């Protein structure tokens, strides 16, 4: 059961419960909104762009949420950004992972903190503080420098 | 499904799940804010990159924790000024020799 105009705009109902059962609203250029009753799905397809503009946007799911792109993903905000998890929080990249702040950077973690790398460089400008319970440094050739002279171990 | 997807709002955006949230990308991921940026987890926070990891801050940097351990393979460098090292037990060990201060 359908309703069509002369340009090709369509609103269609399909009653075949053994396949192709649902509602469709589309045009000939390739914009589709499909309500699928056999599978209980909703599909929205646009050849170029899909825009969601409102005052608030809420996504509620009882399982996974997946976002996939062939290019960048951007998130620009004029206030805070918050991310909370009850498990792990993975930040994995194949080239680099850079974190720049115009103010402080705070890494506060109860229990353990681990850092592993080929080379580690710490570059201070005013002071470098290493306060702890027990301090131990290793290495096959450890050198303590500063000002005129130096100590070689 | 489209070529581009835009979400514009005058207020908050909230994404909630009872499972994982997955973000897979082929080129880049950028996150820019005019205020804070909080990354919180009650089990674990892990980072792994096949390249250099950069941390920049035009202010102080604090790393509060317990059993802080640093591992290297080629060089460890501590550069700056007014360097200080504290601790009740402070042992500096080298090759076949060490000093406990």
């Amino acid at each position: 059961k359908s309703m069509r105009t002369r340009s090709g705009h369509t609103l269609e109902f399909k009653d075949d419960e053994g396949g192709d059962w649902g509602i469709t609203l589309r045009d000939i250029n390739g914009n589709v909104i499909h309500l699928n009753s056999k599978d209980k799905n909703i599909d929205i397809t646009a050849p170029e762009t899909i825009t969601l503009t409102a005052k608030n946007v809420c996504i509620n799911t009882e399982e996974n949420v997946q976002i996939t792109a062939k290019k960048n993903i951007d998130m620009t905000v004029e206030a805070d950004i918050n991310s909370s998890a009850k498990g792990n929080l993975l930040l994995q990249a194949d080239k680099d992972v850079l974190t720049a702040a115009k103010g402080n950077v705070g890494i506060e973690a109860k229990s353990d903190i681990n850092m592993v790398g080929k080379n580690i460089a710490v570059e201070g400008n005013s002071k470098i503080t290493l306060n702890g319970g027990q301090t131990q440094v290793a290495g096959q050739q450890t050198t303590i420098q500063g000002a005129a002279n130096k100590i070689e171990i | 499904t489209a070529k581009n997807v835009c979400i514009n709002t005058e207020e908050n955006v909230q994404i909630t799940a009872k499972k994982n949230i997955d973000m897979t990308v082929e080129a880049d991921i950028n996150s820019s804010a005019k205020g804070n940026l909080l990354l919180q987890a009650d089990k674990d926070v892990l980072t792994a990159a096949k390249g250099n990891v950069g941390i920049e801050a035009k202010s102080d940097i604090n790393m509060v924790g317990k059993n802080i351990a640093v591992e290297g393979n080629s060089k460890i460098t501590l550069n700056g000024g007014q360097t200080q090292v504290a601790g009740q037990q402070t042992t500096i060990q080298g090759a076949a020799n060490k000093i406990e201060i």
Partner: peptide, 5 residues
Amino acid sequence: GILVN
């Protein structure tokens, strides 16, 4: 073992 300065 040490060569300070």
